[PDB]
């Protein structure tokens, strides 16, 4: 699953971004990606983090939006394509993307 851009702690490393554990509830809500469903579609959720800066919040929204742009989801059944799924012709060209498909 996906991970947030966050800052490191600790004066020695405050200036270096790195991967986090999950997007806060506030990002998942403001991106149109429900709490219960983000782990379902491969987005971690971290109930414990706090966002104190618009810069961090908008950066993590940008990661969410990009991921939801380049995410494809197969239907739960064969012919029944419901909301959130994707077109057959879209599904037919999906492969297993390997390595870090979003480098921080």
């Amino acid at each position: 699953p996906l991970r947030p851009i966050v800052q490191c702690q600790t004066r020695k490393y405050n200036m270096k971004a790195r991967a986090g554990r999950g997007f806060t509830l506030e990002e998942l809500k403001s991106a149109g990606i429900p709490k219960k469903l983000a782990p379902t579609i491969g987005i971690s959720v971290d109930h414990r983090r706090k966002n104190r800066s618009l810069e961090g919040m908008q950066s993590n929204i940008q990661r969410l939006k990009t991921y939801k742009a380049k995410l494809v989801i197969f239907p739960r059944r064969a012919r029944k394509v419901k909301a959130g799924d994707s077109t057959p012709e879209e599904l037919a060209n999906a492969t297993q993307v390997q390595g870090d498909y979003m480098p921080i």
Binding site: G42, Y67, L71, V72, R76, L91, T95, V97
Partner: protein, 119 residues
């Protein structure tokens, strides 16, 4: 005598043949002490034929007995499926699939979908 023909017999004739084999071994054991030569070796065949006929008796009897108590009735400790003590005490599959309502809802809704990227 061959197990093929023994399995193809009645219960009473099967018991007769056990009586006869143990009497033939009775005679060979007698003549082991006194005489010798060629009838000293038939002992081993007769002993093995006693074993054959008793194994036939027990196998057929327990097969019949499984047919009768395997009416999905209470089964006896000589029929109950021995595996190992740990295996006997494990939980059955309908018991290991037991989950809660807040969890069976969490899977009836909100399952683990199938996704790729690059769309």
């Amino acid at each position: 005598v061959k197990a093929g023909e023994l399995w193809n017999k009645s219960k009473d004739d099967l018991t007769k043949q056990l009586a006869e084999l143990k009497t033939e071994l009775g005679q060979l054991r007698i003549q082991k002490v006194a005489s010798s030569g060629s009838k000293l070796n038939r002992i081993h065949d007769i002993r093995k034929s006693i074993a054959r006929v008793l194994t036939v008796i027990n196998a057929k009897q327990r097969a019949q007995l499984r047919l009768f108590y395997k009416n999905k009735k209470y089964a006896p400790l000589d029929l109950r499926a021995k595996q190992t003590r740990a295996i006997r005490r494990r939980l059955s599959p309908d018991e290991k699939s037991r989950v809660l309502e807040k969890t069976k809802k969490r899977t009836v809704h909100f399952p683990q979908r199938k996704f790729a990227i690059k769309a």
